[PDB]
Amino acid sequence: LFTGVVPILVELDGDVNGHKFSVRGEGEGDATNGKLTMKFICTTGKLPVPWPTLVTTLVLCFARYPDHMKQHDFFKSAMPEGYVQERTISFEDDGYYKTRAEVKFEGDTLVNRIELKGIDFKEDGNILGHKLEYNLNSHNAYITADKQKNGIRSNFKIRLNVEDGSVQLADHYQQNTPIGDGPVLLPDNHYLSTQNALSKDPNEKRDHMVLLEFVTASGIT
Numbered sequence: 001l002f003t004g005v006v007p008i009l010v011e012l013d014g015d016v017n018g019h020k021f022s023v024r025g026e027g028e029g030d031a032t033n034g035k036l037t038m039k040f041i042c043t044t045g046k047l048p049v050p051w052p053t054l055v056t057t058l059v060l061c062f063a064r065y066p067d068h069m070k071q072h073d074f075f076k077s078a079m080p081e082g083y084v085q086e087r088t089i090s091f092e093d094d095g096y097y098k099t100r101a102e103v104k105f106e107g108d109t110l111v112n113r114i115e116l117k118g119i120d121f122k123e124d125g126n127i128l129g130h131k132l133e134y135n136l137n138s139h140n141a142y143i144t145a146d147k148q149k150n151g152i153r154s155n156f157k158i159r160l161n162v163e164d165g166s167v168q169l170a171d172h173y174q175q176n177t178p179i180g181d182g183p184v185l186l187p188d189n190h191y192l193s194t195q196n197a198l199s200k201d202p203n204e205k206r207d208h209m210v211l212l213e214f215v216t217a218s219g220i221t
Contacts, residue, residue, distance in 0.1 A: 002031040002061065002076055007109045008038065010058050016118030017095075017128065019048040025058060027211075029110065031076070034064030036213040041206050049118070050132040051209040052160055055196060056172060057087070057099050059112050063192055063215035072187035072220060074143075074152050074176065080105040082179045083151075092169040095121035104179060126162055133161040138195045141172075143217075145186040151177035152187065190219035 010025035027038030040051075040058060047054075061075035075083065082104025089097035101114040121128050141156035158170040178184050196213040 001079060001105075002029075004032070005030050006062070008036070008059060008062075008112070009106075009109050010038070010040065010112045010114070012054070012058060012114040012116060014114075014116030014118065016049055016097075016116075017121050017123070019128075020044065021048055023047070023054065023058065029059060029062035031062045031064060034062065034214050034216045036062055036211065036215070038211045038213070039201065039204075040209045040211065041204075042208065045207065047207050049127050050130055050160075051134065051198065052132050052136045053091075053097075053127060053170065054116075055136050055198070055209075055211065056089075056158060056170075057097070057101070057114055057116060058211075059103060059110060060085075060176075060192065060215065061103065061110065063217050065217045069190065069217050069220050071185075072190055073217070074145075074185050074187050075103075077185040078178045081182070083176050084179060085174065085176050087175075088173045090171045090173075091121075091127060092171075094125045094127055094168075095119055102179060126160075126168055131163050132168070133163055134198055135161050136196050136198060137161070138193070141174075141192045141194075142189065143187060143192060144189050146175070147186055149175070149177065150181060150184050151175060154192075188220055190217055192217055 006029045012023040021044045025040040065073040085101045087099045098117045154174040160168040194215045199210045
């Protein structure tokens, strides 16, 4: 199921401050090496927010969990029926993203289907005003079990690069639960670490993002 390369489809329907948009993505995942390769297209025209602010919303089941941590891989153990991933994201000095997603297999394809709402952004801020560099730093995230809520949680911060040279923080608050609320593997506390390279397709005319990404779990011997 995750042994070799798996095709991925991402579908995101959003609106920020009432501006409606949609993103579709295709690529593949290789959980053996923790590797993702994707191309995302804005199917509604110009993306009304910067692409770097959507990377975390646009499949942690492809993180590399080494052998000794397989008993702590919530994301794969919930497959193929899948999980719900929900986030609140607070942007420094600006608005909020509220996201709900279902991650599951639909046939041979791993599908991430997302709804996003962005509330109370400034029209002339860094997000709606498109003032971010086209880049995303490497980041770490602490993963904990929530036995009460039958799932896992994670709170982490992302550092966005602003075109004036400053840094803008995005505080992420995350919760995952299995689709169907059935029995859930409860991991011990551990970390996920991500590297991501954002680029462009020199022949693509639509608003788009090419992504190469590497995610690895650590923290349990």
